Design a protein around this ligand. Structure first.
Ligand SMILES: CCCCCc1ccc(-c2ccc(S(=O)(=O)CCO)cc2)cc1CCc1ccccn1
Length: 229
């Protein structure tokens, strides 16, 4: 029990309530990119002339579990093996063995100024509501304030609320018979000002690239390892 336990529970619960819902029938979501099972949607939202566009994506990855996907997403030690848009990150504080606070800087995208982020990252297993329902693994990354926040005069502080939410279907169980269903949501306030066209182009390019790359890394690192359910 660190000082964020209840904020964490609230963020996680909101994601389980709202983020998991299907949006196939919801015209409010614009489907922007589809590549097979990977479906990437946005809402066009601006606040004070700053693009906030909520991002929501679903995906189905063979041969990995939600537990594996989330560990890989959460574990700072493999971060540099799949991240492409990060200049630097530092663990600011270890809250618990499933929760840390991270500082990171994002590669500049011309012509906007560089962004940095300060966020709590927590991984949690949500037990099946009923023996009918799936268990879910979730990673939530959400912005928090912290005293040990670096001075970075090059950077505008973005604020994020991101969740990677995983449920695993299975048919000795082999990788051949396991499917991981992902819902990934990212609400990012870039702060300051950045050209709308830039923000939307970066999102449209980088989210599908991230999801394809990250999931493929998980498949590759796990294949021929015992399944971690
Ligand atoms: C002018 C560019 C402004 C960049 C704004 C920004 C800042 C941070 C993020 C971002 C994206 C994914 C995460 S995470 O999924 O939690 C994994 C940990 O890194 C945390 C933060 C996103 C974005 C929006 C632009 C953009 C979109 C997808 C990739 C990169 N940049």
């Amino acid at each position: 029990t660190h000082r964020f336990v209840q904020k964490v529970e609230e963020m996680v619960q909101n994601h389980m309530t709202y983020s998991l819902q299907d949006v196939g029938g919801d015209a409010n979501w614009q489907l922007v990119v589809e590549e097979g099972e990977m479906k990437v949607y946005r809402r066009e939202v601006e606040e004070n002339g700053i693009v906030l566009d909520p991002l929501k994506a679903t995906h189905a990855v063979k041969g990995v579990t939600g537990h594996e996907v989330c560990n890989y997403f959460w574990n700072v030690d493999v971060r540099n093996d799949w991240e492409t848009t990060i200049e630097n990150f530092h663990v600011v504080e270890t809250l618990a063995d499933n929760a840390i606070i991270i500082y990171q800087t994002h590669k500049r995208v011309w012509p906007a100024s560089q962004r940095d982020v300060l966020y709590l990252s927590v991984i949690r297993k949500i037990p099946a509501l009923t023996e009918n329902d799936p268990e879910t693994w979730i990673v939530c990354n959400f912005s928090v304030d912290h005293d040990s926040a670096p001075l970075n005069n090059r950077c505008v502080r973005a604020k994020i609320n991101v969740a990677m939410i995983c449920q695993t279907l299975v048919s000795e169980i082999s990788r051949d018979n396991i499917l991981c269903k992902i819902t990934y949501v990212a609400n990012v306030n870039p702060g300051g000002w950045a050209p709308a066209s830039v923000l939307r182009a970066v999102a449209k390019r980088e989210y599908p690239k991230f999801l394809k790359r990250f999931t493929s890394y998980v498949q590759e690192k796990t294949a021929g390892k015992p399944i971690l359910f």
